[PDB]
Write a structure and sequence with these properties.
Chains B, D: This is Pancreatic polypeptide. Helix content of chain A is 75%, strand content 0%. With 24 residues, chain A is mostly helical. Classes of the chains: A mainly alpha (24), B little secondary structure (9). Chains A and C meet through α1 of A and α1 of C.
Chain lengths: 24, 9, 24, 9
């Protein structure tokens, strides 16, 4: 749910960094 | 949740 | 796709902010 | 995309 997303979105910023291998 | 329905997340 | 998600994700900061009125 | 399968998104 959106509440669990509060504690996932913050860490998820790192997941997107892996996906793009930090090449935004 | 709120009064409004679900969202695309 | 992940490509669009890069753009969306950064702007999505506002959505999470609305859902909780920035009361993180 | 990569060799890895779908991620949970």
């Amino acid at each position: 749910p959106v509440e669990d997303l509060i504690r996932f979105y913050n860490d998820l910023q790192q997941y997107l960094n892996v996906v793009t291998r930090h090449r935004y | 949740g709120p009064s409004q329905p679900t969202y695309p997340g």
